[PDB]
Amino acid sequence: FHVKSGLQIKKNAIIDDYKVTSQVLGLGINGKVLQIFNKRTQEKFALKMLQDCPKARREVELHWRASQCPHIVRIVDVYENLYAGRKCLLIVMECLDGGELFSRIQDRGAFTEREASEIMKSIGEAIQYLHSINIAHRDVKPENLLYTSKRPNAILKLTDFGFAKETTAPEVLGPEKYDKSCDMWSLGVIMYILLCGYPPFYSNSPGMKTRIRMGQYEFPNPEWSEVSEEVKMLIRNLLKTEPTQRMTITEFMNHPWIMQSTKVPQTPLHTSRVLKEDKERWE
Numbered sequence: 001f002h003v004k005s006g007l008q009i010k011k012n013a014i015i016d017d018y019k020v021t022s023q024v025l026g027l028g029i030n031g032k033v034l035q036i037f038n039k040r041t042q043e044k045f046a047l048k049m050l051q052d053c054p055k056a057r058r059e060v061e062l063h064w065r066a067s068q069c070p071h072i073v074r075i076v077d078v079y080e081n082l083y084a085g086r087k088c089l090l091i092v093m094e095c096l097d098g099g100e101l102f103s104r105i106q107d108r109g110a111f112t113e114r115e116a117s118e119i120m121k122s123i124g125e126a127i128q129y130l131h132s133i134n135i136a137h138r139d140v141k142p143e144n145l146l147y148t149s150k151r152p153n154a155i156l157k158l159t160d161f162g163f164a165k166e167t168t169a170p171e172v173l174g175p176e177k178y179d180k181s182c183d184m185w186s187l188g189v190i191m192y193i194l195l196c197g198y199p200p201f202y203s204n205s206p207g208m209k210t211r212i213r214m215g216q217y218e219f220p221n222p223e224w225s226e227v228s229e230e231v232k233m234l235i236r237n238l239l240k241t242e243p244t245q246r247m248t249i250t251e252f253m254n255h256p257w258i259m260q261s262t263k264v265p266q267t268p269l270h271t272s273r274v275l276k277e278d279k280e281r282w283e
C-alpha cells in the first residue's frame with residue numbers, strides 16, 4: 001500500500017525564497033530554464049517559467065506525477081505567481097549541472113559497448129516508469145538527457161514534459177494510440193548514436209524525411225565493424241517504421257543486451273572520437 005504526496009502549489013512570491021538570476025541553462029518546448037539559488041541555503045536549482053494556461057497545468061501535472069522516478073528530473077516546488085499582470089507557473093527543479101549526455105561522452109581521452117548498454121538501460125528505466133503510469137514522453141532526445149553532476153557516478157535524468165501526454169485483453173481495458181511507440185523510436189535513435197557517434201538518419205534534407213519514412217539506414221564500417229549482430233537486431237526492432245511492429249518498453253527492458261549490462265563486452269566504440277570530430281554539424 002504505497003501512496004506519495006500530492007502537489008502543493010506555493011503562492012508566495014517566489015523571490016521570498018530564491019535569488020533569481022538570468023543565466024540560461026536550457027530551452028524548453030515552452031519556457032527557458034534559468035539558474036537560481038535558494039536564498040536560505042546558497043544551493044543551486046533550475047527554474048522553468050510557464051504562462052499558466054492548461055497546456056502548462058498539464059506539464060506540471062504529468063511531470064509531478066513522474067517525478068518519483070530516479071531517472072526523471074525531480075521537481076522541488078511549484079509556484080503560482082503574478083508576473084507582469086499575467087499568472088505564472090514557476091517550476092523549481094533540482095539542478096542537473098553534469099551536462100547533457102552526449103557531452104559528457106564527447107569529453108574524454110574511449111566509450112565501451114558496455115557503457116552504452118548501461119546508459120541505454122537508465123534511459124529505458126525512465127521510459128518504463130512513464131509508460132507504466134500511462135505517460136508518453138513524446139520528446140526523448142539527447143538535449144533532454146542531463147547528468148546530475150560531473151562526478152563520474154552521477155545519474156542520468158530525463159527532462160522536459162512539454163509534450164508529455166496521458167494515454168487513456170489489454171486492448172479492451174482501454175484503447176490507446178501509438179503515443180508510446182513514439183518513445184521507443186527515440187530510444188532506438190539514441191541507442192544508435194550511442195554506439196557510433198552519428199544518427200541513423202542523415203541530412204546532406206527532403207531526402208532525410210524520406211529515408212526516415214522508408215527506414216533507410218545502414219550499420220556502416222568501421223564504426224560498427226565491432227558491434228554485435230544481437231545489438232543491431234535490437235536497434236532494428238526499435239527503428240521499425242510501423243509503430244505497431246515496434247518493440248515495447250517492456251520487451252526492451254527484458255532484452256538481454258539491456259537486462260544484463262555487465263554481461264556485455266567492454267568492446268570500444270568510435271563514439272567519442274566521432275562526436276568531437278563532428279561537433280560542427282552536430283546542430
Ligand SMILES: O=C1NCCc2[nH]c(-c3ccnc(-c4cnc5ccccc5c4)c3)cc21
Binds near residue numbers: 028048
Ligand atoms: O524541462 C526542460 N526542457 C528543456 C531542457 C531543460 N533543461 C532543464 C534543466 C533542468 C535542470 N538542470 C539543468 C541544467 C543545470 N545545470 C547545467 C549546467 C551545465 C549545462 C547544463 C545544465 C543544465 C537543466 C530542464 C529542461
